[PDB]
């Protein structure tokens, strides 16, 4: 149970974005139904009044929280991967539009899931803004909690993989468009009951065997991190 508070751009806090530049849902409950329209941008997908200005190559940091800013972030039980997707904003996230910029699942070197590292990072994970065409975009940050993922939601709706989905409105101003954005995958649709990484038993199946759900990270993606960029306590 977690939500995005706001973003940072090059380590500069853009301020509380809830219902402002984040298409915030009404609460931190997960999406679980893989065929739900709620898979696109969570349960209240609509245009919010602001879009955060960035340039290609900026570091864009998403900041998550549980109940209040810079708290426990997400229950420690919620082990799983983190991904970030991008889509042109005029799509409203509909159709074959979502391109993956970032994936972090289980780190064999550190013996830690992305969610574990997100807590350590005070809720912060980042991407490099890609060199796509200037314009308005949706950045879809997705945490998958796998602590009840041994079941399919379609077999037992009390369980299932949990999707914490947050869409940020980002305007890319300066970009040389060296990597034009291709078509991508649909949400809902990309993840099905048979997709690798959706049904996974963390109690019985070693995390070293986990394969995150496709799609693969796009060749145009420039990378990212799970690391604290900014200190909310100094504000
Ligand atoms: Cu939860």
From Swiss-Prot:
Pfam assignment, any one: AA9
Cofactor binding notes: Binds 1 copper ion per subunit.
Intrachain S-S bonds: 41-167
A GO CC annotation given for this chain: extracellular region
Protein modification: The catalytically essential N-terminal histidine His-1 is post-translationally modified by methylation to prevent protonation of the histidine side chain, and protect the critical active site of the enzyme from oxidative damage.
Record's keyword terms, sorted: Carbohydrate metabolism, Cellulose degradation, Copper, Disulfide bond, Glycoprotein, Metal-binding, Methylation, Monooxygenase, Oxidoreductase, Polysaccharide degradation, Secreted, Signal
One of the record's GO molecular function terms: monooxygenase activity
Residues where (1,4-beta-D-glucosyl)n binds: 9, 47-48, 58, 67, 129, 140
Record: residues binding O2: 147, 162
The protein's required cofactors: Cu(2+)
Biotechnology (record note): Lignocellulose is the most abundant polymeric composite on Earth and is a recalcitrant but promising renewable substrate for industrial biotechnology applications. Together with cellobiose dehydrogenases (CDHs) an enzymatic system capable of oxidative cellulose cleavage is formed, which increases the efficiency of cellulases and put LPMOs at focus of biofuel research.
Catalytic reaction(s) noted: [(1->4)-beta-D-glucosyl]n+m + reduced acceptor + O2 = 4-dehydro-beta-D-glucosyl-[(1->4)-beta-D-glucosyl]n-1 + [(1->4)-beta-D-glucosyl]m + acceptor + H2O
Name of the protein this chain belongs to: AA9 family lytic polysaccharide monooxygenase A
Keyword Disulfide bond: yes
Function: Lytic polysaccharide monooxygenase (LPMO) that depolymerizes crystalline and amorphous polysaccharides via the oxidation of scissile alpha- or beta-(1-4)-glycosidic bonds, yielding C1 or C4 oxidation product. Catalysis by LPMOs requires the reduction of the active-site copper from Cu(II) to Cu(I) by a reducing agent and H(2)O(2) or O(2) as a cosubstrate. Is able to cleave phosphoric acid swollen cellulose (PASC) in the presence of a reducing agent, yielding a range of cellooligosaccharides dominated by cellobiose and cellotriose.
Known EC number: 1.14.99.56
